[model samples]
Target: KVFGRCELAAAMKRHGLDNYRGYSLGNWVCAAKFESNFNTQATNRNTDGSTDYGILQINSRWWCNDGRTPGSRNLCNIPCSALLSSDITASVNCAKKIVSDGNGMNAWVAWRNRCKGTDVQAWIRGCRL
Candidate 1:
């Protein structure tokens, strides 16, 4: 997985999740358990040659665009676009702002919800993590 257990805790704290709701890492693990079974190396290709990459199954090709490097500093934080991006904080923030309502688990949940099919977002929102 992009996050190795507590790895998500540090990343979420970096993204301003000062308070852990059952620990930010706990929330993430719950999310994984409900979602993809914590497979960080997970990927699903769209057959158009464009691909979603990495654990969290991010479409770095669409999102990052510039290609993932070891440590592309997103402002000051390290992006979880590549192996370095495993931090996931940057991408989590981005996904949160994509919908832009709440922070913390809401941010991550929002991101996670959006990456799925038509009703996928709703399904994710419906799931209890």
Candidate 2:
């Protein structure tokens, strides 16, 4: 059951987000869209062949809480995210949360503004996503 745009909007608010209206879902959708097309478990293989996992595309192999893995009880584990759950939205929101320091709206605003609202995809492309 993939989340539609409206479903995504409600999900964001349920998670305590606001003021990013037109930009929020587009950013998230594009992280999945441009990075891995909504594959929560999609791993970008580094030249060294490490694994980056989950939504927001956090790299678990190089940068995750240890003890959490594809086999751990951490249901928010990498493979589970890239492959299952609406929690993918939650995960991206988590990144937003951390980056925002619990600031609810325009969490990505400063950076997105620097990018001039072209889109999150452009920003990620700047990172070479």
Candidate 3:
């Protein structure tokens, strides 16, 4: 399912990620846009051959496994499919865990290449923060 920018923001804030850890909501908004365009069903293959899952694009190498991938650490302890859904609660939970593990939003190359150090207020332009 495709979620609107504001809709995604509202849901994420409800999960207490408006400022979860040290990252801001704007950062997340920017990330979601670049990562998956707020599309829950989005999936991509990384250059290293790892698979990215869901709206937040959690990787199968360290986070979750689709079972097709080998040597997956499954660090998040959830199915890779769990990240691909209309309900982003599992994605948010796993994201928090990733950040707590010390990657920060930088775990997402999208965030680093696009959102990091850039003005992200426009990412949430019309969204009520």
Q: Name the best candidate (by lDDT).
A: 3
Over 1-129, each residue of candidate 1 has an lDDT whose tens digit, in order, gives 445444544554566643333333334445544433445545555455443434343443334442333233233232334522445554455544323334534433424564322332332342233
- Report residue 36 deviation for candidate 1 (angstroms): 5.3
TM-score of each: 0.39, 0.45, 0.94
For residues 1-129, write the lDDT of model 3, one tens digit per residue: 899989998899999888888888889888999999999999999887789998899999999988877789999999999999899999999999988887788888889998899987676778776
Would you list the rank order by TM-score, best first? 3, 2, 1
- 10 residues in a row with least lDDT, candidate 2: 120-129
lDDT of each: 0.42, 0.45, 0.89
lDDT of 3 at 48: 77
lDDT (10s digit) by residue, model 2, range 47-69 = 54444555444544433433443
- What TM-score does model 2 achieve against the real structure? 0.45
* Each candidate's clash count: 4, 3, 0
Window of ten residues with lowest summed lDDT in model 3: 120-129
